[PDB]
Structures are given as C-alpha cells and as structure tokens.
RNA sequence: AACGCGAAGAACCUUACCAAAUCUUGACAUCCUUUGACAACUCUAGAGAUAGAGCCUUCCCCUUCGGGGGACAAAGUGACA
RNA sequence: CCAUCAUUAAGUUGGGCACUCUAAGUUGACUGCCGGUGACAAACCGGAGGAAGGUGGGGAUGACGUCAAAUCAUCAUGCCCCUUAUGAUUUGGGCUACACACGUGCUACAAUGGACAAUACAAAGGGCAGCGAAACCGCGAGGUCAAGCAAAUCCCAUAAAGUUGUUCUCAGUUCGGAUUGUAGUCUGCAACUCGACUACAUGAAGCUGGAAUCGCUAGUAAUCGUAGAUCAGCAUGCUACGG
C-alpha cells in the first residue's frame, strides 16, 4: 500500500468502464474488498458480499479518502 | 481431511504469499523446522531412533 | 513413571548412528530420501529377520547396510534378490550404488528381532504369558545377561488394558555404560493393537 | 591451501585429520597441522508432550567440529592425498587450491 | 495566545492545543528565542515574531474544529472506522475483550 | 464462591444453575466465615454406563473433593453436598482444638 | 623485567604484566579513573599487592578482555595475583589467606526451560 | 539448609572512604534495583551535608546516630494459641546491626524533600539528636514489647 | 497438575468453522483396461476454482512388426478411495 | 591472538611474534591425606595440601506405582457412523465480536528519576538471492547500487543499564503516551474487516494499591539490553544470552 500504485481490484475496473459511458445500471455484484475509491467510481452501486448477503451501497464524493470494503458490516453485532 | 491438505500443499499455488509448509510424513503443518522439514513429534522420535544424522540429545 | 527410551540417552555417548552422512547445504530433502528407503526396505522385506539398517552417503555412491538375522534371504540364490533389490532401490533414488548386507550371530538377542518374533506370536492368539516366558528363558540361555519385556493393551482379549512385564537380570537403564537395546512392535489382533516392548543387555 | 575439515562426530574428524597429516608428510610437504576451529552448534528446543504440555520440554542440539589443513609446499606427490579420496564416511572436505 | 508564564518556553508553548515539542525546533527556527526564557523574557518584540509563525499553524483551538468534523464526516458515511466512534468501541481494529477500557 | 461449570458432552441448562447455588453454594457459605474461593463442577457423560459429578472447592489449607457416579444430576448433588458437608467438619474440628488449657511456667 | 600473569572472573579474561617502576595501571592503554566508572572498587582492587606492600614498585598496564566493569575489575586483582607469585613467590601464603589468589569461583546460572529465567519459577494462581 | 543446622554467614568488603564495614552495608540496603554506583554516589553526597551541619566527621556521627535506632527488645511470636502469643525477646547482635540500618532507610524515603541527597542526611541528624521518625518507632517498639512484659 | 496451554508467527493460505458458486472413480492411492497415449502453453467468459477454443501428440530402448518397460491420463468399473 | 620492530589510516598489516590469550584433543577431588577425645561405629567438627572440599555449581537421567489423569486433531487402529457427502473445490467472511468476569504478563504511577549532549564495557546466535557494510538521499520508519561471503575473518551489531556534563524543581508539572486525525514507510495478488513501525498532533486512567496471594537462599531475587526458532510480514510470549 505504497504511493507506488494505489491499489485497484482491476477485475472490477474493467466492469465499471462499461457503466460510466452511457446511462448507468444500478447494480454490480462484486466483492471489492481489495480496491480503493477514486473518482471514477462515483454514482455506481455495488453489492458488496459481506460473507453472508451482498449489501448494496452507492458511492458518494466524500468516499474518495477511503476504500470500498470498509462499508459492508460482517460482525452482525447488535446484541447487547 | 488430512491428505486433501497434503495434496493442496504439493501443487503449485497461484501466489507466493500462500507459500504453505507441512511435513513429509507428519500431517500437521504447525511445528515445522525449515532445515529438517519435520514435525516436533517425529523429530523427537527419529532422533531418539538415530535415523537423522548427528544430533546429540541434551544437557549442554 | 515416564521412562524415556534407553537408546535416546546413549546415541553417540555409548552408541553410534543408524545414519552417518553429512550435508551442509540441502540438508532437508536428502534427509527425506533416508526414510523413503526406511519405509521401502520395511515394505517388501516384511520381517525378513531385519533388525535395523544403516545409511551412508558419499559422492553419489550411497551405501545401505542391512543386518538380516536370516541371512541370504535378502541375497536370494547366489546374489539374486540382492540384485533384485537394486533394480528398484536405484530407481527410487538416483544411484543407490554398492548395496550390500552383513550377517549377525545370535539371531534373537538383538532386541528388534526379540520384539518382532513374539509379536507375530500374537496373531495366532496363543498364551501371551508363555510368549513372554519363551523370550525370557531363551535369553540368558543363548548368552544374554538381563532381559525385560511387557505387553500393554487389550491384554488377553479383555476390555481394560493392563501392562504385564517379566524380568530378571541386571538391566541398568540409568547407567550410561550399558548397551541397552529396546524395540517396539505393532502386533494387531483384530480387536485393536497390542504394543510390546523388550529390553536386552549384553 | 586450506583443506576444510568439518564433521558431526569428534572421534571421526580427529582420525581423518591424522590421515591427511600423515599422507602429506610422506610427500614433500611442510604441513601446518590441524588447529581446531570453534564448533558451530545449534540448539533445537521441541516440547515433549504429544498434545498439550509446555513447561516440560526436551532440548536437542547438533554440533559440527571444524578443523582446517593447509600446506605451502605443492608437489605432485602432496596432491596424491588430495586426489586420493579417503575416509568418505561422515566427513566432507572442501578442497581449495 | 493563552500561554502561561514562569516556566521555560520549550515547555510553555506546549500548554496550548496543537503543540508538542515543535516549539523546541519549529518555533525556535523562525524566532530568535533561547531555551532559558522564564517569565522574565521581555517577549513582546518576540511576541510579534512568534505571531508570524503561529499564524501558519492550525494549532490554537481551530485544529479541534477540523478534528471534530472529520469524525462527523466519518460517521455520516457510516464507515467501519466511523461506526466505532458512535457505538464504546476501540476504533483502530483492536481486541474489544477485557483490556479495552479507555473507550468503555 | 463462583461456579466454573462445564459439562463433558452435556449441554448445561439454567435449572441446574439455580439448584447448584442453593445446596453446593449456601450450605458452605456459613462455613468458612472469611470466604473468597472458586468452586469447580464437572459433569462427564459416559454413554456406556452413566454420568458423574466432580465438585472441587479449594481453600486456604485443605481442599474439598467429592464424586458421585449416579445418572440423576439432581439426586446425585444431594449426595455431593452430603460429602461436602462432612469434609468441612473434618477441617474445622482439626483447627478448633485451639482450646487447650496450657498454663505457662 | 616483565612478570606476566593472567586472571579470570565472571566470563572476562584479564592478562597482566609487571614492569618495575611505581603503582600505575594502564587498562586498555588509558587511565583507570576514565575507564573504571566510579573509583570505589579500585581500592578493593589494590588489595592483592597491599599484603606484599609493593605500592611504588610495579607498573602493570593490563590488557583486559570481555565482561563488564566489575568483571574486568576483580579479574586484574586476580590477574596480578598470579603475577605476584612470580614476583614474591614466598609470599603465596599472604595472598592465599587473604582473598585474591583463589579462583574464578562462579558465573551466571543456566536458564532452565519451563521457567521464567534462571531458577525463578513463574507465578501460578490456584494454590 | 535452615533445618540441617545454620547457614554459614559470609564476609563483606569494607568501604574505601570511611574504612568501615558499616558504610558498605548501608550502600547495599539503599541500592535499589541493583544499581551500585547511582546509590553509592548519593550516600557519598549524604554525609557531606552531615559534615556541613555538624563539624564532626560523619563516621563518628553514623555510629552515634544508629544507637538511637537500634532497639534492645523486640517481639517474636510463639504459637501458644489463646495466649498473647507475643514474647518480648532481646535482639541478637547480627540482627541488632541490621534492623537499625533498616529503619534508617525505610523512613528516609518518606520525607518532604525528593532528593536522597538530603532525604537521608536529615534523618541521620535527627537520629544523631535522638529525634525524628526512625527514632520514634524504636520507642514504639519500646512501648509495645515493654507493655507486654508478662512473658520474659 | 487448564487458562502468552496444542498456536515455535490466524490478512489470503493456514482453517478444521460459516455463507455462497459446482463436483461425484472424485484435487489423493491402488489394481488397471483402449495404455484413447501430455488438451506439458495462450486468448475469451468469469468473485474464482472452472468452462470454450488457439496447442509443444508424444516419449525412451530394440527388436523388425511396430510391440512391450518408464511411456500422459480421455474414459471405466470387479473395485475402491 | 601482537609484550619486543615500525610506515598504526589502527590493514592489527611486514615478519611471524606463538609467548600470553582464545579455540579444541586430555591429567586431575575422595573424606585420598591429618588432628579431635570420639571411641574406633560410620559419620560429623577443625585444619592443611591443589585453582577447586566435602554428592564442588548446574544439566541430563524420574524405581514400584497413583490419577479409567491428557491427546482416537502429530500419528497409528478395534468398533460405530457417513458416501450427490459428515467427503470435495474455490474468494468472501470468521477464529480478532463485547454490559462484562477471573488467569498471565508488559508499561507505569518518578527527582536513587525525566529530557539533551558526550563517553565506555559483553556474551550467545544467525546469514543455501540470505545477511547486506562504508557512502548517500529522507525529520524518521527507510529507498539506490556496488564493498565484502555460503564465513573464528564479511555482515546483522554502535548492546543497554552505566559513567560525565547541562538541565526541569517535589503536581495528574519536561512524570506516561493510553486513545483518536494527519506520513502513506515496508513486506507481501492484496493490510476494510484484520498487521508492523515513526511523523508531527492529541494527551485519558494512574501518586506505589485493602482482604488476601505468589516467586526467590549468590552470581540467585531484582533489573538492563542483545539473539534465535517459527516467519514474505508480525511477540509485551517462548527459548537461550550476558551486564
């Protein structure tokens, strides 16, 4: 995770360049745990598989500081 | 269970990060010695039996 | 108590090695070729009165010495089976040159033989206490000094395991002078595994 | 010339040092004899129990006994011991020229 | 800004928000102050030359304004780094068993 | 006077977790008048014969062990508490012979 | 005249010599008070030649090796004690009865496994 | 071996400055956590203030101050059960030396000043003048062991 | 005499657990039969294993005919794993 | 490994100084040797004799046996069970969750300290593309190549505590540094779940702890730092090491 090559999943970047040309579709079933959020991802909706059930989330413009896997929870905590 | 994991090891993985080690007769992976490639159980066994070359017992 | 095995005290102190080679670089992989041909020699011989083997390696002429309490059976008929062994032993490794065999007198005073031949007196399931006493009474008759042997589990055919040892003679397990030799066999009786230890001296 | 003599046993590396110091003085040599390098031991500390127990363990060690032989009178009779391979049992010889 | 007197200036500028052991080097760079300046320092003509270098810094209170909204931005996106603020969670991937007390 | 309970191949209920403290707990609370200790309850099922219950309570000097090999895990503790209450009285009358009339010279 | 003795204590060898002159030590070619740290144990280090009273007699100039400062000291007073018995050989009973000439008697003890460090067993809760 | 017999007690090395065994034993008891030099320097700067606040040399003042510390009766507990179990027993000369050194240091650590530059030397001149805090617990032992005098 | 113990190295692997995606002579071993004799390498589709094509159709000896021994396993079950 | 020779950058180089040291192959400590009043009954008690003295210190070695003690998850096999699965194959979780409750340790709650400058002294062990110097370029974690080498020499590696001097002045203050945002350093297909440091910020509990309880008889308690096995990366653990 150096300056040299901020990491992209790159099996997802190929699937999002077809989306941003014309009118976007509102689902990409993916895993996206490895990749970061850079401004070629805004608007699109990803169903991030948290191990159990793929959770939809769409990308805002304040999301560029963080990466894509940090959103779908895997704990299932609520409990006490 | 055991020989599936032995078969998983000896094939070449996709990644050098996986780089997984076990023993040649001990099924366990979890106590290897990379000069001996033996588990701690049988290395205790075949050094008492002397099948390994020169290795004293103890009491330096 | 937790008696450790009597060979492990004495390897190099009052004994020598069952493998006497050296390899600084690539010590790991060509150590595995030893217990390849420690399994493999123990496969097709299949109690040809084999006590133990020795391995020595020098300049891709790697030696194997076997003791063979019944000599000639590994040799065959005038160098037949000894040449029929190097037809496979030289294929499992590269060279396996200068395969040979020496002989031993007193066929059942080496403890590897003494444990094995009365462990094979357990698949016929006949009188384990005499199977003990056959080994003790013959021992110092043939020239031994101290004898000690036991059988551990599923003793006699019952449910609860019971050790059962018989002894006489000087068996100094704590004295580092002593040439104690032990062995452990894996006699199955189709209701579990019986374990049998022996202890010979001189 | 620095003939490297290293081995696991100490009775074997000493009797094989007596071979090379004998089979060189018979030739035209001026042998600086065997001086003992320090032994490069290594301790392996396994634990004794089959399943559980620490706090009760058996230590293991293996010792290499290093010596070196050097000659500064190279004749073709001195190298007859160098070309002549003897005691190959548990000693390696790293012959440098 | 609101620094206390009667102590050395290498520890005195530490008392405000936003300075720890940078007054030993960074404030000492621009201003020609020394290490042994007590209350008796006459730092009024030197008050101006530290005012020029502290004006570039975010230190005196206004950093805590940006520090507060960085958490508020972080919880509004509802990240795992942000849920741990709003939920007493240690945030930086720590073991939340027995010895996790300072977040309660 | 905690109860680190654990059952070998038996799922512990909560009706046991109140029946323990009434008999194993309370009948030894009035013994040991300065108490700070931990109990230990094993329940080991054996499919061939029965279950067994082991209760060990260590103290300052002498511990307290008892075993029953019954299968009823409510009637067996009626005998564990019987063996526990006997062993405490052995401990106390051992140390309640302080009352010895010894007049110094 | 160079009466060269050796001396060991606590995994630190110390070889000395005895050139005549006066009492002046040159441990590792430098002054003692700038090498040995706090000057207390130097008057305990002068105890071996005190009983032969050769104060203004011998310069020593030790080359010491290994150990620490109380391992380098207490090994040159044992160092010159082997050298004082080839200076005053009849004065052996003066050093045998009082201190210096005994030995390197004891070093650090082996760390046994299954233990914290060197015979100190670790704490357990339930007695 | 404390039941085969008695342990053979060992010799110490006297100080170079005062030429006293008693000074070195004070060095070893103020030696917190094995630091010999960093504690010996403090004692060598805790008798100069003694020799500053009194003209006498401190090797006289030390053995004069500890005599107001060293008690002559103490309490050894004998397991008599229902009795008082506190027998007033006089002090052996080895424990007589040690237990005075113990009280001199253990109450030097509980004064107002922080440096043992003058934590130590203040209590010495108090013990030289038969006052302070390490003297007054000797009298507390001499009001406890001398109150239960029915077990001589 | 359990509790920095099996763990002398849990991001993936380990991993035995769970949720998914798809396999049944099984990723492994053995007789084996035709030994069909490497799909021994790249593009495309893909969480990804896998799937579809482009493909190094062989490998050594010794007869004389093209077999047997090591030849890869595409299919097989008496079996077995 | 350099007393005596010097051209000491120290090449510890020239010679070899081989002497000491060190590193390895062997000679020697047992109540052998005396005196006790001590009577013979061995011991004990006190000497001298060697460097060592009373099984020298320590390790290895654990009798008959006890606990149906602990592992059918290192293995191995009696019996039972499973066979479109209770076996497989993948990336994605989890083993790292938490209002909590006991174990075991680390760092502390300071002016026998803290911060900054100087200046010493070790042992053990590792280095099969691994250890990577001296230079640089970075505040730093570190990057770029060659210098050496498969090693008593080359490297990890300048141990640290100490000592010397300047400081703060006795407050939750220059005590420590938990926790949160800024560096993106490095390893690795990839550090979000879920790493490792350092960089400027922020600075919380904490003023030596109740009843109770544990370790330890000399190079031992105590402390200080260095190594290795695991390991691509990662210990406050473990195992060895000396001060």
DSSP string, chain G: -------B-SS-EEE---EESSSB--GGGS-STTTSSSSSTHHHHSHHHHTTT-TTTEE---EEESS-HHHHTTSSTTHHHHHHTTTSGGGHHHHHSSSTTS-----PPP--SSSSBTTBPPP-S--
H55 touches strand J (CB under 7 A): no
Cα gap G46→G54, rounded to integer Å: 10
Size of interface D-G (CB pairs under 8 A): 8
Range list of H helices, E1-104: 9-12, 26-30, 45-54, 62-76, 80-86
DSSP letter assigned to residue F101:
-
DSSP letter assigned to residue A70:
G
Contact residues for F41 (Cβ-Cβ < 8 A; gap 6+): F3, F4, F5, F6, F20, F24, F53, F54, F55
From chain G, pick out residues whose CB is under 8 angstroms from the CB of D45.
113
**H150, closest residue in chain F (CA to CA):** F104
CB-based contacts of C70-73 (< 8 A; 24+ apart in sequence): C70/C107, C71/C101, C71/C103, C73/C48, C73/C49
Query: C32, C41, C42, C58: which to substitute to probe chain B, counting the most B Cβ within 10 Å?
Result: C32
CB-based contacts of H41-50 (< 8 A; 24+ apart in sequence): H41/G38, H42/H116, H42/H117, H42/H120, H43/H120, H44/H17, H45/H117, H46/H116, H46/H117, H46/H118, H46/H119, H46/H120, H46/H121, H46/H124, H47/H121, H47/H124, H49/H117, H49/H118, H49/H121, H50/H121, H50/H124, H50/H125, H50/H128
B18 touches strand I (CB under 7 A): yes
E58 touches strand J (CB under 7 A): no
- In three state form, how does the secondary structure of F60-95 look? CCCCEEEEECCCCCCCCHHHHHHHHHHHHHHHHHHH
Cα gap C162→C195, rounded to integer Å: 11
For chain A, give percent helix, strand, coil, nearest 5.
15, 20, 65
Contact G43, G37 (CB under 8 A): no
Chains interfacing with F (3 or more CB pairs < 8 Å): G, H
Whole-number CA gyration radius for chain H:
17
The dihedral through the CA atoms of B23, B29, B31, B34 has a sign that is positive
From chain B, pick out residues whose CB is under 8 angstroms from the CB of D60.
43-44, 47, 55-58
Nearest to E80 among A62, A63, A73 (CB): A73
Nearest to E73 among A62, A70, A71 (CB): A62
Nearest DNA or RNA nucleotide to A28 (CA to C1'): I47
- Pairing type for strands C100-101 and C146-151 reads unpaired
Nearest to B57 among D41, D48, D60 (CB): D60
Residue F29, SS3 per DSSP: coil
**H152, closest residue in chain F (CA to CA):** F105
C22:D7 CB<8 A: yes
Which tokens is C87 given? 């037809």
- In three state form, how does the secondary structure of C158-187 look? CCCCCCEEEEECCCCCCCCCCCEEEEEEEE
Cα gap G25→G49, rounded to integer Å: 13
Contact F54, F65 (CB under 8 A): yes
Which helix (H) or strand (E) segment holds residue D57: the answer is: strand D57-62
C21 close contact with B: CB closer than 8 A:
yes
Cα gap H9→H97, rounded to integer Å: 14
Contact F91, F81 (CB under 8 A): no
Q: Shortest CA distance to H44 belongs to which of H18, H68, H19, H70?
A: H18
Chains interfacing with E (3 or more CB pairs < 8 Å): A
Nearest to G37 among H15, H16, H37 (CB): H37
Q: Shortest CA distance to C70 belongs to which of C122, C45, C107?
A: C107
In chain H, the N- to C-terminal Cα span, in Å, equals 30
Cα gap F53→F42, rounded to integer Å: 6
DSSP letter assigned to residue H1:
-
**D59, closest residue in chain B (CA to CA):** B58
Whole-number CA gyration radius for chain E:
19
Cα gap C159→C154, rounded to integer Å: 6
Cα gap C144→C147, rounded to integer Å: 8
Whose CA is nearest the C1' atom of nucleotide J125? D42
**Dihedral angle over CA of C10, C15, C21, C22, nearest 10:** 40
D60 touches strand I (CB under 7 A): no
D44 touches strand J (CB under 7 A): yes
Instruction: Extract the annotated binding site of B for Zn(2+).
Output: 23, 26, 39, 42
User: Is chain F in touch with chain H: ≥3 Cβ pairs within 8 A?
Assistant: yes
Contact D92, C24 (CB under 8 A): yes
Cα gap C159→B44, rounded to integer Å: 31
Contact C80, C72 (CB under 8 A): no
Contact D95, D3 (CB under 8 A): yes
Return the residue matching tokens 């939809």: A56
Which helix (H) or strand (E) segment holds residue H64: the answer is: helix H58-65
D9:C12 CB<8 A: yes
The dihedral through the CA atoms of D12, D17, D19, D20 has a sign that is positive
* Tally of CB atoms within 10 A around D89: 15
B33 touches strand J (CB under 7 A): yes
For chain B, the residues whose C-beta falls within 8 A of a C-beta of chain D are 31, 33, 40-41, 43-44, 47, 53-58, 60
Residue F59, SS3 per DSSP: coil
**C27, closest residue in chain B (CA to CA):** B35
E77:A66 CB<8 A: yes
Resolution in angstroms for this experimental structure?
A: 6.8
Q: Shortest CA distance to F62 belongs to which of F91, F33, F105, F23?
A: F91
| Burial of H68 from C-beta contacts in 10 A (0-12 / 13-18 / 19+) | buried
B19 touches strand I (CB under 7 A): yes
Cα gap C166→E85, rounded to integer Å: 73
């Amino acid at each position: 995770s150096i300056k040299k090559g901020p990491f992209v999943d790159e099996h997802l970047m190929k699937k999002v360049e077809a989306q941003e040309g014309s009118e976007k579709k509102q689902v990409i079933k993916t895993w996206s745990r490895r990749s970061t959020i850079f401004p070629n991802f805004i608007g699109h909706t990803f169903a991030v598989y948290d191990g159990r059930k793929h959770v939809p989330v769409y990308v805002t413009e304040d999301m560029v500081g963080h990466k894509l896997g940090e959103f779908a929870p895997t704990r299932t905590f609520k409990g006490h | 269970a055991k020989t599936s994991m032995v078969a998983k090891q000896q094939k070449k993985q996709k990644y050098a990060v996986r780089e997984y080690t076990r023993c040649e007769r001990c099924g366990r992976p979890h106590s290897v010695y990379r000069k001996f490639k033996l588990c701690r159980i049988c290395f205790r066994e075949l050094a008492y039996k002397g099948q390994i070359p020169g290795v004293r017992k103890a009491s330096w | 108590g937790q008696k450790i095995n009597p060979i492990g005290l004495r390897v190099g102190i009052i004994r020598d090695w069952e493998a006497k080679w050296y390899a600084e670089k690539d010590f790991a992989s060509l150590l595995h070729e030893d217990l390849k041909i420690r399994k493999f020699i123990d496969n097709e011989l299949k109690e040809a009165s084999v006590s133990h083997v020795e391995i020595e390696r020098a300049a891709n002429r790697i030696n194997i010495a076997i003791h063979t309490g019944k000599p000639g059976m590994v040799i065959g008929k005038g160098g037949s089976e000894i040449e029929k062994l190097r037809n496979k032993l030289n294929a499992l490794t590269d060279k396996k040159v200068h395969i040979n065999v020496i002989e031993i007198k007193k066929v059942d005073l080496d403890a590897r033989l003494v444990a094995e031949n009365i462990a094979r007196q357990l698949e016929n399931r006949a009188s384990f206490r005499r199977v003990q006493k056959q080994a003790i009474t013959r021992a110092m008759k043939l020239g031994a000094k101290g004898i000690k042997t036991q059988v551990s589990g599923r003793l006699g055919g019952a449910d609860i395991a019971r050790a059962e040892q018989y002894s006489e003679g000087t068996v100094p397990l704590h004295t580092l002078r002593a040439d104690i030799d032990y062995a452990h066999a894996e006699a199955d009786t189709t209701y579990g595994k019986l374990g049998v230890k022996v202890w010979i001296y001189r | 010339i620095r003939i490297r003599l290293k081995a696991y046993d100490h009775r074997v590396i000493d009797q094989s040092a007596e071979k090379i110091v004998e089979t060189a003085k018979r030739s035209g040599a001026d042998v600086s004899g065997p001086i003992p390098l320090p032994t490069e031991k290594s301790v392996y500390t396994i634990i004794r129990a089959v399943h559980k127990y620490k706090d009760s363990r058996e230590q293991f060690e293996q010792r290499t006994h290093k010596r070196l032989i050097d000659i500064v009178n190279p004749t073709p009779k001195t190298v007859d011991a160098l070309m002549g391979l003897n005691l190959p049992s548990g000693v390696d010889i790293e012959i440098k020229l | 800004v609101d620094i206390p007197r009667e102590k050395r200036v290498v520890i005195s500028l530490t008392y405000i928000y936003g300075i720890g052991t940078s007054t030993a080097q960074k404030i000492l760079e621009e201003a020609n102050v020394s290490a042994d300046t007590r209350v008796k320092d006459l730092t009024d003509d030197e008050l101006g030359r530290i005012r020029e270098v502290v004006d570039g810094y975010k230190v005196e209170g206004d950093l805590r304004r940006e520090t507060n909204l960085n958490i508020k931005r972080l919880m509004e996106i509802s990240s795992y780094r942000g849920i741990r603020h709003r939920r007493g969670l240690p945030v930086r991937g720590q073991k939340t068993k027995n010895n996790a007390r300072t977040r309660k | 006077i905690r109860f680190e309970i654990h059952g070998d191949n038996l799922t512990i209920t909560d009706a046991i977790r109140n029946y323990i403290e009434e008999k194993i707990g309370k009948l030894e609370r009035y013994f040991n008048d300065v108490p700070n200790a931990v109990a230990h309850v094993k329940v080991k099922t054996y499919s061939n014969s029965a279950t067994k219950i082991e209760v060990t309570i260590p103290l300052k000097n002498v511990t307290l062990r008892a075993e029953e090999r019954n299968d009823d895990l409510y009637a067996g503790i009626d005998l564990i508490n019987n063996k526990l209450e006997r062993q405490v009285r052995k401990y106390k009358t051992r140390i309640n012979r302080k009352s010895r009339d010894r007049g110094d010279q | 005249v160079e009466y060269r003795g050796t001396g060991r204590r606590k995994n630190s060898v110390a070889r000395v010599r005895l050139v005549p002159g006066e009492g002046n030590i040159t441990v590792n070619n430098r002054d003692v008070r700038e090498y040995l740290p706090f000057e207390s144990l130097i008057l305990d280090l002068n105890q071996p030649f005190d009983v032969t009273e050769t104060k203004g007699n011998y310069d020593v100039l030790v080359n010491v090796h290994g150990g620490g400062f109380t391992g380098q000291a207490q090994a040159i007073r044992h160092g010159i004690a082997r050298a004082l018995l080839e200076a005053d050989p009849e004065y052996r009973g003066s050093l045998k009865r009082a201190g210096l000439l005994t030995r390197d008697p004891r070093m650090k003890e082996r760390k046994k496994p299954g233990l914290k460090a060197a015979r100190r067993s670790p704490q357990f809760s339930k007695r | 071996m404390p039941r085969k017999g008695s342990v053979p007690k060992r010799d110490v090395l006297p100080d170079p400055i005062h030429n006293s065994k008693l000074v070195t034993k004070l060095i070893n008891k103020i030696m917190l956590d094995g630091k010999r030099g960093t504690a010996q320097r403090i004692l060598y700067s805790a008798f100069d203030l003694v020799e500053q606040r009194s003209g006498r040399d401190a090797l006289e003042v030390f053995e004069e101050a500890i005599n107001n510390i060293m008690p002559v009766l103490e309490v050894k507990a004998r397991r008599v059960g229902g009795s008082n179990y506190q027998v007033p027993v006089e002090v052996r000369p080895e424990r007589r030396t040690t237990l005075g050194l113990r009280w001199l240091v253990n109450y030097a650590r509980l004064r107002g000043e922080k440096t043992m530059e003058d934590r130590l030397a203040n209590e010495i001149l108090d013990a030289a003048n038969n006052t302070g805090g390490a003297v007054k617990k000797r009298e507390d032992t001499h009001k406890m062991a001398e109150a239960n005098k029915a077990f001589a």
